[PDB]
Scaffold this active site. Structure first.
Site, PDB file in Angstrom:
ATOM      1  N   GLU A  34       0.855  -1.074  -0.240  1.00 50.75           N
ATOM      2  CA  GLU A  34      -0.103   0.288   0.255  1.00 50.75           C
ATOM      3  C   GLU A  34       1.073   1.300  -0.255  1.00 50.75           C
ATOM      4  O   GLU A  34       1.671   1.107   0.697  1.00 50.75           O
ATOM      5  CB  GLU A  34      -0.584   0.657   1.724  1.00 50.75           C
ATOM      6  CG  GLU A  34      -2.177   1.041   1.171  1.00 50.75           C
ATOM      7  CD  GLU A  34      -2.998   0.830   2.376  1.00 50.75           C
ATOM      8  OE1 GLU A  34      -3.471   0.574   2.179  1.00 50.75           O
ATOM      9  OE2 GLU A  34      -2.554   1.095   3.824  1.00 50.75           O
ATOM     10  N   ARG A  91      -4.846  -4.268   0.065  1.00 54.37           N
ATOM     11  CA  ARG A  91      -5.946  -3.485   0.137  1.00 54.37           C
ATOM     12  C   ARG A  91      -5.670  -3.647  -1.514  1.00 54.37           C
ATOM     13  O   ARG A  91      -5.667  -4.186  -2.108  1.00 54.37           O
ATOM     14  CB  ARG A  91      -5.735  -2.443   1.041  1.00 54.37           C
ATOM     15  CG  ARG A  91      -5.866  -2.865   2.482  1.00 54.37           C
ATOM     16  CD  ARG A  91      -6.560  -1.265   3.056  1.00 54.37           C
ATOM     17  NE  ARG A  91      -6.656  -1.371   4.001  1.00 54.37           N
ATOM     18  CZ  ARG A  91      -6.075  -0.968   5.357  1.00 54.37           C
ATOM     19  NH1 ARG A  91      -5.299   0.630   4.773  1.00 54.37           N
ATOM     20  NH2 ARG A  91      -5.816  -1.231   6.389  1.00 54.37           N
TER      21      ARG A  91
HETATM   22  N1  LIG Z   1      -8.297   4.236   1.462  1.00 51.66           N
HETATM   23  C1  LIG Z   1      -7.844   4.268   2.326  1.00 51.66           C
HETATM   24  C2  LIG Z   1      -6.128   3.397   2.217  1.00 51.66           C
HETATM   25  C3  LIG Z   1      -5.726   3.770   3.835  1.00 51.66           C
HETATM   26  N2  LIG Z   1      -6.452   4.558   4.673  1.00 51.66           N
HETATM   27  C4  LIG Z   1      -6.023   4.325   5.906  1.00 51.66           C
HETATM   28  C5  LIG Z   1      -4.741   6.471   5.868  1.00 51.66           C
HETATM   29  S1  LIG Z   1      -3.450   5.613   5.558  1.00 51.66           S
HETATM   30  C6  LIG Z   1      -3.909   3.421   6.810  1.00 51.66           C
HETATM   31  C7  LIG Z   1      -2.983   2.681   5.972  1.00 51.66           C
HETATM   32  O1  LIG Z   1      -3.716   1.435   7.037  1.00 51.66           O
HETATM   33  O2  LIG Z   1      -5.030   3.614   6.154  1.00 51.66           O
HETATM   34  C8  LIG Z   1      -7.719   5.517   4.154  1.00 51.66           C
HETATM   35  O3  LIG Z   1      -7.696   5.461   5.531  1.00 51.66           O
HETATM   36  N3  LIG Z   1      -8.609   5.327   3.126  1.00 51.66           N
END
Ligand SMILES: Nc1ccn([C@@H]2CS[C@H](CO)O2)c(=O)n1
Ligand SMILES: Nc1ncnc2c1ncn2[C@@H]1O[C@H](COP(=O)(O)OP(=O)(O)O)[C@@H](O)[C@H]1O
Ligand SMILES: Nc1ncnc2c1ncn2[C@@H]1O[C@H](COP(=O)(O)OP(=O)(O)O)[C@@H](O)[C@H]1O
Ligand SMILES: Nc1ccn([C@@H]2CS[C@H](CO)O2)c(=O)n1
Lengths: 222, 242
Positions: A34, A91
């Protein structure tokens, strides 16, 4: 051709840890991380921080950039000749929209206009996409309490103020999508994608043996 | 494709829709992709296939109005949607119109280049987008153009040149509600951006072929009947050079 498996679960459930372990099992297996570092340093501005600080102002900007940066990376990984290739996504664009973006809208951190634009952008952006369709999903299940503790362990500066209640809401969305399966997406194929649920609440010595082999069991069925 | 792509560029209310929608009658091989301004003043996303049978598609938000009311808050959001909705409309028309035409020409009402280098760029320069917003926007724009390769590449640009004063008068004539508070000064800044890009050709872009793309400049300040003949002649001449 490549099997695409998304790893899903709450903030600090241990998705990066697990997939970075798992991937050493086979030269045929690669990970798409990610792009969090690219959110911490926009290239630079910290759009991740701006969203945590001022979510009514920055949630839409964050969410659009998050999703774009994920598509970019996932598509780049498909482009660059193996027996049984497996690519593990940290993800997916579905969690982007149906978990995170959705939760922000539910919390009134995005307004009706912003949520409409986001959905229209996501619909079109993924309809072009196409090669990113998943063969399977591994759900790493940790309690919000575990996730909060792991947040502290990891020490990401932007995450340190995250309240338990926010993790709880994220947990309930994951449960609705991946365990109860009551969360409806407009991506039809997704209702047939097999899901492997792993409990990762224990310290890693306790079960990682059994967990890796469960992934082996799972992937041979796809 | 074998389809010739021509963009029509110029300021707000310069007369682009009017001109091009009359011009396109001259040939069954000529068609237009209008600018999706209605999608911006009434923001809507696709309904589920069962839901649409029992629920109306409702009037959504007006992001065009939001941008004008508070540019420093809504500019990034507007510009991102403007560009997405444009690309969607242009691509769909490329893969669907003018199938079996002899000498097909698709006229675009503005381009993704004007989205970035006129409008978004003006907002950034006016502090209506911050560095983070401007970096994100440019990054997204760059990536999308890489993706399509030559799909949307222009064969030619027609620049409809009108003074900011003329544009301001034409805004009043047209009477689009969200445009009624637009000041001369905003139209002037937009004007100068078009002149740099299309007339003086000093404005540098991240797309190398643009520096070579043929440009026809038409002065559209006169009343419509007064020059239309001359303009049609110049367009027909230009197109035969491409
Ligand atoms: N589309 C996403 C993906 C991830 N996040 C959050 C903010 S960073 C954290 C990384 O786990 O997850 C988020 O808030 N929105
Ligand atoms: N099973 C586990 N037991 C103890 N610590 C873990 C476990 N899984 C992850 N951690 C630790 O928790 C933190 C979050 O893990 P990480 O893999 O970065 O989470 P994610 O990628 O899901 O956000 C890290 O400090 C990591 O070393
Ligand atoms: N040459 C012209 N003479 C008189 N009115 C014009 C002329 N060109 C355009 N108009 C009028 O000016 C207004 C703006 O024209 P329009 O084509 O909508 O501009 P654009 O598409 O460039 O925004 C409309 O009311 C239209 O009828
Ligand atoms: N990318 C764009 C395209 C057009 N505009 C303005 C607002 S709508 C009006 C239509 O001429 O032009 C804009 O502000 N930004």
């Amino acid at each position: 051709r490549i099997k695409k498996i998304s790893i899903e679960g709450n903030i600090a459930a241990g998705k990066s840890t697990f997939v970075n372990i798992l991937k050493q099992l086979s030269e045929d297996w690669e990970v798409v991380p990610e792009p969090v570092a690219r959110w911490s340093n926009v290239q630079g501005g910290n759009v991740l921080q701006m969203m945590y600080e001022k979510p009514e102002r920055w949630s839409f900007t964050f969410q659009t950039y998050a999703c774009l940066s994920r598509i970019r990376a996932q598509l780049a990984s498909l482009n660059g000749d193996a027996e049984k290739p497996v690519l593990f996504f940290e993800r997916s664009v579905y969690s982007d929209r149906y978990i995170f973006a959705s939760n922000l809208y539910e919390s009134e951190s995005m307004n009706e206009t912003e949520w409409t634009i986001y959905q229209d952008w996501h619909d079109w952006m993924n309809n072009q996409g196409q090669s990113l369709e998943l063969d399977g999903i591994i759900y790493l299940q940790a309690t919000p309490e575990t996730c909060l503790h792991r947040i502290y362990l990891r020490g990401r500066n932007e995450e340190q103020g995250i309240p338990l209640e926010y993790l709880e809401k994220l947990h309930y969305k994951h449960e609705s999508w991946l365990l109860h399966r009551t969360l409806k997406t407009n991506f039809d194929y997704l209702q047939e994608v097999p899901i492997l649920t792993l409990d990762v609440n224990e310290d890693f010595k306790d079960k990682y043996e059994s967990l890796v082999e469960k992934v082996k069991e799972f992937l041979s069925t796809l």
